[PDB]
């Protein structure tokens, strides 16, 4: 795959900021994308986006949709390239 990449803490973690991530994997091992964001005091903060490794949760999910009820940080993962560019939850 390739996924959308975002790191909100890009400077301290010495990574890139925004763009694409090209996923490195293993032989026929599945690859996914993830989106992760906060909802602190009515403002939606983006946390990270990028490649997620073979995860039973993300299986055959086209839309990145978070499922946990009212978590601190929201997380979703999805299958298919760039699928993590858009994220929701419910």
């Amino acid at each position, epitope marked *: 795959r390739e996924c959308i990449y975002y790191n909100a803490n890009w400077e301290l973690e010495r990574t890139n900021q925004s763009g694409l991530e090209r996923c490195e994997g293993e032989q026929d*091992k599945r690859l996914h994308c993830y989106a992760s964001w906060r909802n602190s005091s009515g403002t939606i903060e983006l946390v990270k986006k*990028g*490649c997620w490794l073979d*995860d039973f949760n993300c299986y055959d999910r086209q839309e990145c949709v978070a499922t946990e009820e009212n978590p601190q*940080v929201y997380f979703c993962c999805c299958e298919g390239n760039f699928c993590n560019e858009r994220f929701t939850h419910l």
Partner: antibody
Amino acid sequence: QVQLVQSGAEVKKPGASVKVSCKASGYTFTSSYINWVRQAPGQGLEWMGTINPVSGSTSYAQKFQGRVTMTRDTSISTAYMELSRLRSDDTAVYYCARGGWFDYWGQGTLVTVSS
Amino acid sequence: SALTQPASVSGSPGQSITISCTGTSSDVGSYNYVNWYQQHPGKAPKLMIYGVSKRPSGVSNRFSGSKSGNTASLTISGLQAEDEADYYCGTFAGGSYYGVFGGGTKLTVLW
């Protein structure tokens, strides 16, 4: 390539606490979970909990619910496990493993909790 | 919900042995997320099969996995002396899913 290396061996006195480290190299640390599993000498594998290094979230084994603390410092790609209010039947080898399939295991950290 | 697998099994070199991992339809019956770890004494577990049946790179094709009903089964073909180890089954751990392991099986390969 993919490799998790753990903190050295710990000897503790009961009631105390221990915190073990897990240093992921060889892949993108925040690209999958870290899992923690311990093993009482001559015995099975026991699952303790999972940490999602991105979200920062944690799930815990009910057995350990409320005295084990799981964390990570993503800026050095290291996950931590802290077991507090130790005992005797806490004496084990402690493992971290990559991702929910546990597809790569650390080398283990022996924690001996003896008076 | 514990996974139960036999205490030990013995094999002769060249033979096939199969270790089984049984739970309820809540878990094993419901999800293709059983995995098999080999563990030589005093060393860390290694992943042999995951996702019921899938094999990582660098894992001998002699190792295969399957599942019928509420039991997943690891099968080691053409036994070798180096196949002698502890074998645990677990399930996927993370997300909606919480971890569990079997008691393990001690596979003895008598030469």
